[PDB]
Every structure is written in C-alpha cells, then in structure tokens.
Amino acid sequence: REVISIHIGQAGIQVGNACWELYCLEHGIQPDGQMPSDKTIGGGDDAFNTFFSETGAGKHVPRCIFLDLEPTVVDEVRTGTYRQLFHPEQLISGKEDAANNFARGHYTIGKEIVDLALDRIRKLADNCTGLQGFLVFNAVGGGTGSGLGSLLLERLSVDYGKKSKLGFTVYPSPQVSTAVVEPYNSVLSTHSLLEHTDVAVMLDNEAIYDICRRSLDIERPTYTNLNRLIAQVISSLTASLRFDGALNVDITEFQTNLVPYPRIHFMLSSYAPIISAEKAYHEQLSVAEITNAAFEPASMMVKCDPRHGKYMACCLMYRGDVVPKDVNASVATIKTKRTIQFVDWCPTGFKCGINYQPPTVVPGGDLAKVQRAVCMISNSTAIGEIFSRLDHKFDLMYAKRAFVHWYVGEGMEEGEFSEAREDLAALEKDFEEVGA
Amino acid sequence: HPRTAADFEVLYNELEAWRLQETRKIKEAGLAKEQEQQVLQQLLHKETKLLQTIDRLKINANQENKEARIQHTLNEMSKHTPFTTRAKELQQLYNGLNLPLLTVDERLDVLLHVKWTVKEFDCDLTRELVDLIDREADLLNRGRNPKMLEGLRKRISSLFLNFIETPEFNPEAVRF
Amino acid sequence: MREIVHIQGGQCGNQIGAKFWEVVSDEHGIDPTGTYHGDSDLQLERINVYFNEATGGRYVPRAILMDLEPGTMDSVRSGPYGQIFRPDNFVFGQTGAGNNWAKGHYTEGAELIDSVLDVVRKEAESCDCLQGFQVCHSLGGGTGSGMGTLLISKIREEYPDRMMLTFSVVPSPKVSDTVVEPYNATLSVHQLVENADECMVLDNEALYDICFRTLKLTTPTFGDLNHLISAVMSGITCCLRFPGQLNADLRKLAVNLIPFPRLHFFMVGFTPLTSRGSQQYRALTVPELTQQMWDAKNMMCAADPRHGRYLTASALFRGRMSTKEVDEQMLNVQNKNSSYFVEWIPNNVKSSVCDIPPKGLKMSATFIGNSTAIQEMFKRVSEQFTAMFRRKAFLHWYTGEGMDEMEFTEAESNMNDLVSEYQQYQ
Amino acid sequence: MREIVHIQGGQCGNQIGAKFWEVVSDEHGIDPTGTYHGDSDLQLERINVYFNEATGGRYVPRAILMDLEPGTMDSVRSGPYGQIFRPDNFVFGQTGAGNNWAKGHYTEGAELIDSVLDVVRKEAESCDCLQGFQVCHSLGGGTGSGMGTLLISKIREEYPDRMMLTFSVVPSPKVSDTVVEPYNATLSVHQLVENADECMVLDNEALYDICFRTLKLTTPTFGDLNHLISAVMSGITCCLRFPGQLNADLRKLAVNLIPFPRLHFFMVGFTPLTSRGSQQYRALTVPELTQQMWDAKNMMCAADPRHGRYLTASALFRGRMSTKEVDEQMLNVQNKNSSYFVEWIPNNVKSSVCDIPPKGLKMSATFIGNSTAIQEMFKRVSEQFTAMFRRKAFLHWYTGEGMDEMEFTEAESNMNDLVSEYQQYQ
Ligand SMILES: Nc1nc2c(ncn2[C@@H]2O[C@H](COP(=O)(O)OP(=O)(O)OP(=O)(O)O)[C@@H](O)[C@H]2O)c(=O)[nH]1
Ligand SMILES: Nc1nc2c(ncn2[C@@H]2O[C@H](COP(=O)(O)OP(=O)(O)O)[C@@H](O)[C@H]2O)c(=O)[nH]1
Ligand SMILES: Nc1nc2c(ncn2[C@@H]2O[C@H](COP(=O)(O)OP(=O)(O)O)[C@@H](O)[C@H]2O)c(=O)[nH]1
Ligand SMILES: [Mg+2]
Structure with missing residues (x-):
C-alpha cells in the first residue's frame, strides 16, 4: 500500500513543500529524517511505509520527485529546512525556464530531462512492492506544469499503463491570473489531461481565496496559506491507506465509484471545517454542521456554482470520531435538501469512508485543532461553465493569432491549436449530453 | 471592399482555406526536416500580414457602417406630424454640417443657423456646443486654413448629433 | 547559473552602466576594493550571474565597455566602484567619431568590432549557461548608437537563441543637444526593430x-x-x-x-x-x-x-x-x-x-x-527626419562617409510602418 | 472608520485649523513630533477618524491646507505642531486673491482648484468609509468666501451623498476688518445655501x-x-x-x-x-x-x-x-x-x-x-449690500474680473427670500 508523488512546476513544488511538512509532522518524523527515540506517538510501523521508505538505519525518505527547469525553487528546497528529508537525487533541476511556453516546455527543453525524470521514477518504483498509483501536482497556467507535465503523463501512461493517476491540477482563475498567455497553455494541457488521467481533481485560486477570507478570516492570504489547505485536502483523501478505520476507502474505488464514464472524470473538492482558532471552540462542530458546510455552494476549491448542473457521484472522507449513524442521517438530510438536485440515473450518490485519525495541525497555521473533519470529492456536471469560460477567452486570443509565433518558433502548430479547441468543444458537448 | 459581416465571413473562410492548402502542400512536400519549421514560421508571418490587412478593412467597414446607419436612423426619423417635420429640419441641418464645407461664407451661414436653433434650449450641452461654434467662427474670421479645422469640425458635428439624439431637443427621440 | 552579459556603449551607456554596476555591486554587498562583504547568504548564491571569481575573492564584474574616446574609460576607471572592472574588458579604439552614425557604424565598426566581438565571445563562452545580453546605450550619439547597433546585429547573427535587453535612451524634442538627433534615431530604430529582442x-x-x-x-x-x-x-x-x-x-x-x-x-x-x-x-x-x-x-x-x-x-x-x-x-x-x-x-x-x-x-x-x-516618441522623430531630409541638410557628412539616401528611405519606411501598425492596434 | 477629512481655507481657516489640530493632537495624546505619547488605551480606538499611519507609529492628520498666499503657509509651518502635516497636502497658488471674491472664485480658483481637488480626492480614495467633509473658512475674504465656496460646490457635485460640516466665521457689523465684507459674504452665502450642509x-x-x-x-x-x-x-x-x-x-x-x-x-x-x-x-x-x-x-x-x-x-x-x-x-x-x-x-x-x-x-x-x-445676522449684511449697491461702489473690481452685473442682484434676491423664509416660520 505505497503511493509515490511527482511534483512538476512552481505550483507543484510549492504545494509539495507545504505538504511534506504536514506528512512528516503527522507521522511524527523529525525534519532531519529519523524518528525520535523516547517520545512515542501512535503505532505506525507500516503507517509510515506508504509515503516513506526506511533506509535500514532509521532514516525515512519520501517517495517523491520534485522537478523543475528554473532551478531557483529546487535549490531553495535544497537549502531550506528539509535538506535531509529528501534524497539528494529526487530533486531534479534543469537549466533554463520554460517561460509560459507549452511548446518550449514540451518539445524543445522538455525532451531532454524527462528521460532522467522517468528513469528516476523507474528506479524509485522498483523499491516498492505494493504500488497503488501515482498522483501529480501541476499548474496548467505555465510551461513546466503544462508542457513537461503532459510529456511525463504521456511517457508514464505508456510505460506503466493500468495504474491510476490522481491529478491535482490548478486551472487559472476566471478573471484573476498572473500569466497572460496562459489560456493557450491551458487548452494544450487539457488535450493531454483528458485522455491520460483517470481522475483529475481540479483546484482554482479565487475559490480558495474566497474560502480563506470568508471562513478562515485572513484578508491578505498568500501561497503559503493556499498550499497548506491543499495539503490538508490531499491528506484527508489519502488517510485511509495509512490509518485503519471503521470503513476504509482506498484508491481503486475512487475510480470504480466516482467515474461513471471513461472520460467524465473531473472532481470538485471541498473540505470542512475550514475554521480559525477563535470561532473553533465557540462553535459546536458535529457531523451535520460540518457536512452542511462542506456542501454549501461557496465552499468548493474551484470557483463554479454547483447549482447549475447535477451531482454525479460524491465521496465523503471523515477523519476523527464519527459514528455511522449520524453520518447516515447527515447524508439523508443532504438528499432531502431542495438546493442540490442529483442526476437521474444515479439514485445512490454518496460513498462515505471513515478513519479514526483526527485531523493534524501545523504549528503556525490558521486551522485550529478539531475533533473531526470531512473532505468531499464530487463528480458533477457544473464544470462545463469553467471549460466554456476558458474557451471563450482562448478564442478571443486565437482570432488575431496573437502570441502564436512564440509557439511556432519551438514546434507548435495551428493544427493542434484547433485540435485542442475542438477537444474542449467535444468535452463540454459531452457534459451537456450526459446531464440530460 | 467589405461592408457586411457576411462578406467578412466569406473572406475569413477563404483565407482559412488558403492556409489549409498552403500547409497541406508544405506537409506533402515531405522534405527539409529542419527547414520545415522555418517555412512554417514564414507561413505564419504571412498569415499575420493578411490578418492585419483584414483588421484594417474591418476598421474602415465599421466606421462607414456607423456613418451609414446614423444616416439611416435620420431617414427613419422622417418616414406629416409636427415633431417629424422638426426632425426633417434637423436632418437638413445635420446634412449641412456633413457636406464638405468648401466655402467659408456658407460655413459661417450654416453655423449661424445652427447656433440660432440650438440657443433655444440651453440646459448644459449648448454651453460647449456654442463654445465650439464660436471657436470655429473666430478661427475662420481671423483667417486660418479650414483644412486645419478638421478635428474641431468633427467635434462640432459629434456634439450636434448628440444634441439631436435627445428627447427634449428632438421631441421624438423616444423612438430610439 | 543563468548568465547575463552586460555591454555598454557610448557616453550614455558608459555612465548609465557605471551607475548600474555601483548599485548592483553594493546590493550584493561587495566593497570597491574587490572583496565580498555580504552578511547574508542570499547574496553569494547568485553572484555568478554578474560576477566571476578571479583568484581570492576578486569578484570581477562581467561587462564589456566600448566607445571611441579615451575620456569615458578614463572617467569610469577614476570613478567610485570603477576599480573592479577588468582592464582587458576595456575593448577600445583611439580616435572618437562624434554624432556621426555613419562614421561610428561603417569606418570604426570595422577596426573595433573585430575585437569587441572577440571579447564578447570569450566572455560568453567563459560562463556555463548563458541567459542573455543586456546592452545599454543611446540613439542620438555616434559611438553608442551606430557602434552599439552594429554590435547588436553581429551578436544576433552569432547567438540566435538569447534574450536581448536594450536599455536605449532616445532623443527628445524639447531637450535639444545636437542636430543629428533625427538622423541617428531613425538609423538606429531601423535596425533595432529588425534585430533587438526588446528595447526598454x-x-x-x-x-x-x-x-x-x-x-x-x-x-x-x-x-x-x-x-x-x-x-x-x-x-x-x-x-x-x-x-x-x-x-x-x-x-x-x-x-x-x-x-x-x-x-x-x-x-x-x-x-x-x-x-x-x-x-x-x-x-x-x-x-x-x-x-x-x-x-x-x-x-x-x-x-x-x-x-x-x-x-x-x-x-x-x-x-x-x-x-x-x-x-x-x-x-x-x-x-x-x-x-x-x-x-x-x-x-x-x-x-x-x-x-x-x-x-x-x-x-x-x-x-x-x-x-x-x-x-x-517615434512620430516626433519621424516628422523631424522628414523635415530635415526634404532639404538634405547635414547629409554630406554621411554621404562622404559611405551611407546613401537609400538607407534613409528604408529607415523612414520602417519607422512609418511600425508607427502605422501601432496606430492600427488602437 | 467613518471618516472626516479637514479642508482649511484662507488665512483664518489656516490659523483656526492649526490651533484645532494642536488641540486634537493632545486630546488623543499625540506628540507634536508625530509619535504617540498618550497614557490611556481608549485614546487609540478611533484615531483613524482623523489620522493616517505613515511608517512605524507616525500618526498624521487628514487635512488639506488651501490658500493663495504662501505667507500664512510659512507661518503655519513655523508654528508649533507644524511638523505633523503631510507636506504633499500643502497647496497654494503663491499669487494672492487680495480679498477679491471674483478673483478668488474665477481667476485664481480656476488655477488652484485643479490641484486642491486632486489632493482632496486622494484623501477620499485613501479613505474607505467616508462620513463627510469638514471645512473651515471665512465669509469676508477673497480666498475664504470665493474659493472656499467653489470647493464646496465641487465637493457636492462630486460626492453628492456625503455631508459637509463647515465652520464659517462671518463678518459681524461692528468688528469689520475690511470694506467689501457684504459684497463677499452675500455672494458666498449664495452658494452656501444650496451646496453646503451645515454652515456653522x-x-x-x-x-x-x-x-x-x-x-x-x-x-x-x-x-x-x-x-x-x-x-x-x-x-x-x-x-x-x-x-x-x-x-x-x-x-x-x-x-x-x-x-x-x-x-x-x-x-x-x-x-x-x-x-x-x-x-x-x-x-x-x-x-x-x-x-x-x-x-x-x-x-x-x-x-x-x-x-x-x-x-x-x-x-x-x-x-x-x-x-x-x-x-x-x-x-x-x-x-x-x-x-x-x-x-x-x-x-x-x-x-x-x-x-x-x-x-x-x-x-x-x-x-x-x-x-x-x-x-x-443676514439682515445686517443685506442692508449693507443694498447700501453699497445703491450707488455702484466698488463694483468694477468684480465686474472686470469676470462677474456680470446680475449675480449681485441674484445674491440680494436670495438674501431677501432667505430672510423671508425665516420670518415665515418664526
Ligand atoms: N494555488 C496556488 N497556485 C500556485 C502556487 N504556486 C504557483 N501557482 C500557480 O502557478 C501559476 C504560474 O505558472 P506555472 O504553471 O506554475 O509556471 P512554472 O511552474 O513557474 O513553470 P514556467 O511556466 O516554465 O515558469 C500561477 O498562475 C499560479 O496560479 C501556489 O503555491 N498555490
Ligand atoms: N540621462 C543621461 N543622458 C545623457 C548622458 N550623457 C549624454 N546624454 C544625452 O544623450 C544624448 C546623446 O548622447 P551622446 O553624448 O551623443 O552619446 P555619445 O555617442 O557617447 O557621445 C544627448 O542628448 C545627451 O543629452 C548621461 O550621462 N545621462
Ligand atoms: N478666529 C480668528 N479669526 C481671524 C483670525 N485672523 C483673521 N480672522 C478673521 O478673518 C477675517 C479676515 O479674513 P481673511 O483673512 O481676509 O480671509 P482670506 O482673504 O480668505 O484670507 C477678519 O474679519 C478676522 O476677524 C484668527 O486668527 N482667528
Ligand atoms: Mg516556471
């Protein structure tokens, strides 16, 4: 029961830097890579063996590769507070940036470092004996995330095949975005995410900013504040493979349970209770309230109002002391509500997993310790809004053939530009056809 | 020379067909496995030139359509109620401003007529309209080349059109 | 690990780049003596982009200084923080040209660029992985505009896949400092719009x-x-x-x-x-x-x-x-x-x-x-150029140096078309 | 949170506002150097109604000094608590109205309001929740009575849903310090009656x-x-x-x-x-x-x-x-x-x-x-206006400055109907 992580691009590496901290803290691993001696917390002789190895003489090493082209972030990690945690070879850094150029990141520069990245993946996966699947973190708003990421997905799907790939992909926010040429890279990376990932959990930025300014009450957030709760979501998703519980849910039925069609796999993610250290003890936090807060429209990591379409399949992971009775009652109330309508062909919509490990907490965070937590991964039909919204502002650029020379100077073609355009068209058409 | 979005659509589609034929010939050449990308870049630059020419034609067509449709609205402002008769009179004044004011004397005469007509209401717009009329009158009386009074004449025409496109000043403008 | 090579040409380029080097050296924390004094660790981590260790802390800046009059290098060497530039990077002639784009771009562009290119090539191949070229100069001068522009063309031919940041100061309408400003500006633009990666x-x-x-x-x-x-x-x-x-x-x-x-x-x-x-x-x-x-x-x-x-x-x-x-x-x-x-x-x-x-x-x-x-900023120069070229004023100083009227016609045409397409995108 | 921005106009306005800020600074405990040197906690709770935090506990007033002569500005700067204001707010035309209402509302107002309005707009946009504007001025001088009311009209047209509370020191009949007091006061109340909100x-x-x-x-x-x-x-x-x-x-x-x-x-x-x-x-x-x-x-x-x-x-x-x-x-x-x-x-x-x-x-x-x-107080100024308007005294200094002969009659009419509308409800 071991799972490996690959981090591609600035966003991926930064989220991984804010996630492996949580992982080592949750399993009690000291930042230098070895557990302490006298202090003893929990029983985890194989509860650590999923994300970490053990190099014989008490020195755990994560099953993850960070990789970048701009070596600044990678050597920042190499000189950071986690010099010893990582292996000195799982941190791959090329020479020159991709510079918001999918073509430069996928064709010219990308094709000279993936050969080393996937070789490292090979001689990393040879060390396991119960491999489950991969999970990728990337932003499609740039070059390394889109280009090198798509190349690595291609050359890993062709190599390892059947194994699942949990993508955690950052789409651009609708109107807030640093990069400007990013719609091109978004469509180009979509035309590879659609046919090479089994489950693609989407993440946005305006949605998370809204969450951390309405519930968490932090009016000037930052990436160190976004990646912490993204890591919270990842940990809540993958807790079951590390911790026993009343009802354990592993990675196979996230696909055999939330993906009704070979191509309709796009997850809205939510997490409750996103709470501060002042409202926490003053609020009575039980299963019904945390579930309602999870299901409210303005609690999704992606900015789309999940009232336009219907829910196809919801999966609720509970951490902490939760009994089956009250969670069953809560999902019954959720069904009884009048705001959300489920799709017709799927009468039973939810799958609830439970685990006895309470949510962790990072000293210096905003989310205070709580007894329980819920994380929802929902396959819905309200993502056509997002895809069409990105499509319109891709077309606006493409009409004038602006910025296209930067792509054709590295190897792109208007052929595949129009190919990705019609691919998005087909995807949104499929959403429209399946909604009915 | 296009004027309709349909004709622009025809031009766009024939250009795209030309692009496809050119790239198909380049591909079916099946040669120059290193100059292929340079030929592609040159083809894209050609495409950019033609698209910019289409953009220029689009700007010209948009301006000419705007002028033609303003004239059309003025005509629909005529097709014998007293309000419609006043509308016809204002259309005459606007056509007098539109026509090439080749003669300084007729220019001054029509400016005098429009100033008399405008000075009746005098709420807020007539202040700047009269200021511009006096500006043109003075810069013609002292003697300056009318070819240098182009933007100012354009501004007078625009303000007069805005005056006409007003309910109280033209007591039928509720139509549009 | 990404490498920028900083070239500076003309009086403007020399003085501006000298100020830039004082600021950058101070910010990375090196004294004018030539040693390192940055207390933090974030400073040593990227000195390699602008500095090379010579032997024992003597972090010599990576820069090229080029013009035709000895006074500018004399002043730069005399000024503060001017004791760090390597003397062999003072690639330099002897005569001086002065306000003549043709003289600085055709005559001395032969017997000086033949060594400026050598110095630039050596300095570029010295480092491991280049990032690009950062060149500062003027447009209204002779030893910075023409010489710098010919250097730009040569280095674009040599290294095709490299960033180019041209910090160019352009002539002003009101600030009159010489009469050949429209001529030099149009001539320089005619090649910057053709080769320069981007002009700040x-x-x-x-x-x-x-x-x-x-x-x-x-x-x-x-x-x-x-x-x-x-x-x-x-x-x-x-x-x-x-x-x-x-x-x-x-x-x-x-x-x-x-x-x-x-x-x-x-x-x-x-x-x-x-x-x-x-x-x-x-x-x-x-x-x-x-x-x-x-x-x-x-x-x-x-x-x-x-x-x-x-x-x-x-x-x-x-x-x-x-x-x-x-x-x-x-x-x-x-x-x-x-x-x-x-x-x-x-x-x-x-x-x-x-x-x-x-x-x-x-x-x-x-x-x-x-x-x-x-x-x-280009329309004013273009109209001044048209007004002056309708009379062939000051034209003989170029025509007897080697330039013809075809160069002026081409410069005017390119200037007008780029301004016209700016106007289009509006 | 709810905001008051303090505009002072004229010599009297400048002096009164200077003393008023001297008073409020000690009421909140702020050192004239600018720092906070109070005793109680409760002083700090609402100092954002009058102040801004510049750099490390430098509380500065939200005031704009507006006048046409720099002498009173120099005196205010010299005086105590002078080093509390933002020097950017200091705006003045340096020429001088000379107790000429027409000059201060038509001649120099048209040239200094373009900047004083910019400053007050900057303060308003630096604010978040505007309660309203506070104004200090006189009704017997060129700048105070003319430019003050012009600025008041500008503010009312810009922000129509914000109050103005304005302290107007009016010319009493027997402590008069100039001869055109009613010609200024009546013309100023002409606009104060229809623009301002509380004319204290x-x-x-x-x-x-x-x-x-x-x-x-x-x-x-x-x-x-x-x-x-x-x-x-x-x-x-x-x-x-x-x-x-x-x-x-x-x-x-x-x-x-x-x-x-x-x-x-x-x-x-x-x-x-x-x-x-x-x-x-x-x-x-x-x-x-x-x-x-x-x-x-x-x-x-x-x-x-x-x-x-x-x-x-x-x-x-x-x-x-x-x-x-x-x-x-x-x-x-x-x-x-x-x-x-x-x-x-x-x-x-x-x-x-x-x-x-x-x-x-x-x-x-x-x-x-x-x-x-x-x-x-209005009868005693309307009578004087009629007295010096019956034989056309001092009219040309306003007539040739931009004003016509009908604005004075309009001002007299508004005085008469205002007095009538108090008499009606007495
Ligand atoms: N939510 C979140 N988004 C991030 C974070 N870091 C980077 N991003 C996203 O990453 C985008 C930048 O483009 P990237 O795909 O990361 O480009 P890159 O990884 O730097 O690689 P290049 O495109 O070659 O520069 C921005 O639009 C951000 O939205 C993060 O910590 N949290
Ligand atoms: N900002 C700035 N401008 C300068 C400086 N030196 C010269 N200039 C301007 O640059 C323009 C032409 O530069 P020039 O002296 O001909 O450069 P040269 O070719 O090296 O002689 C003139 O208009 C000057 O005003 C300087 O040190 N700083
Ligand atoms: N309360 C007070 N009133 C003053 C002061 N100085 C002048 N005044 C009054 O202001 C009136 C003159 O206003 P003036 O300064 O001419 O206004 P300005 O022309 O706009 O500067 C006189 O009647 C004085 O009574 C002062 O320091 N305090
Ligand atoms: Mg990057």
Missing part, C-alpha cells in the same frame, strides 16, 4: 520632470538622473538572482509582453518614488505602490500613456507581500481603466513577485508596459 | 465679548479665540471617537436639526467656559452646564436668541452623567422658556451623552441651536 526605451525630459515632482530635487544632475535608470535595470533582473513566490525570467517577460515580434518597445517605470522630505509621511504598501505605478507623470518616457491603449503590461514586485492583494490590485486597475486597455486580450497585466527588496528599503516594484502610446 | 456660523464679536466677560481676559489674542473654536469642533466630533451612553453622529445631528433644506445655519456655544478665578469657586454639575449653555451671553454669534424662537436645539454632553438628570434638565429649560420654542415641534431639544470628557476637565457640553434669531 528611455528619454530625458520625463526623468527631469520625475526629479522635479516625485523627488523635488532642485539641481538634478546626471549622477541621479542615471541612478534612477540604474535602479530600474537592477530591479528588472530580480528573479534570476533572488527567490520569491513567483519567479519570472527575461524569456517569461518577453513571452508575456510581445504579441508580435515588432511590438517590443517598452516604456518603463519604478516605484516608490518620493522626496526625502516626505519619505516619512507616506505609507509603504501595495495599494499606494500600484497607484504610483499606474500614473502618467511617473513613467520614464515622454509618451503620455493614456494616449492610446496598453497592448500588455508587466509588474515586478519585491518584498514580502500578499499575492492576493497584488492580483486584486492589478485586476482593479484593469477594470477601472478598461477604456485604456485593448479588448482582444483578457488580463493584459502580468504580475510576478519576489521575496527580496532592494538594499536600503523594505518594498519595491517595477513597471514594464508595451503600450501603443509609445508611437509618439 | 461664528463671528469674532461674540468671541470678544466672551473673552471680556466670561473669561475676564484683558488682552485676548487670536490664539484664545482659535482655542474656543477648536473646543467647539472637538465637542461636535466626540461620539465618533469615544463610546457613550447615547450616540449622535454628524448625520444624526443634521437630520435632527434641519426641518427644511434651507435652514442649515446653526449657531453654537460651549460649556463650561470658566474664568480662571471662578473655576476654583464654582462646583460644576449638570444644572450648571445647562445654565451656562442656555445663557444667551455665551452664544458665539451676534444673534440674540431673546428676539427669536428656537426651531431645534441639541446638546452634546461629555462626561459620565445621569441620563435622567440630563433629560429632565432639558425638559425644565423647555418648560421655563415656554415662548422661545416652536409650538408644532414637541421636545425641541435632543441631547447626546459621551463617556469621555475633554482633557483635564471632568464634565463638558456643547450647544448647537437652529433658531430663527440668526436672521438678524
């Missing part, structure tokens, strides 16, 4: 008015008129040297700011700018820095930026901040001034941040805008 | 009488009169800055004291103004405060209330009082002086209580009455 154009009356209002200096000399430009040149190269929440290199800036390869003439700003008297009464925060950035009397070009639209713009922030408020401010500016932004691009503004402010401060920004209002 | 009327004759009798001062310089006016300002702006058993903000006072939209010329006082030889003798209680309040010989105007009926009255007390005591005292006054109050308005007195009395004192109060007795 600058002028003089905009900077003078900046020193009058935003700083209230009473006698603004070149020693600070160039200090502003030095600060901008240091601030543009922030990601290649310092960590941050969102790194972005010169290739990234070009990709985000060049819709078409003939649209690469940026106008530049810098914030905060405030007088020493009121450096105590203002609050240092992104809401005020952004408003100062998006101002007309704050840019460093004599083109009123509202006189058209912004095809694209970029902001580079330095200092701990909130990438939520940075993005919110950028979007707020877009939505408020939607009229002055082109329509067929959404999110015309890119914004990248870094975690290291410049020395002696706590927060800073930099603005790089590719707008169509920069057309006037 | 003051005059120096009443202040002189107060200093003679109540304070028993022998040689009162302008400092003490400015101190009294500052005390009135602070008394008005205290619920906005400290907690209280009852709340009455600027909007509440306006909506309570203005029955009809043309009767917004309030007349005020202050308690307890005690001679320093009787402060040791009198024991201060709520009845004593209300006695000195309704004492007609304490009102800061030459409009005796015995001749006019009261439309509305408000009393803003400061000190931990007894609310029953305050209200029953108001009732007792209303029942005693049963003829001076309007019959169709029951309980003409509104009383608010704040918990923090001013510095030093243990009990204070401020009276703001809207009575019909004020129309004497």
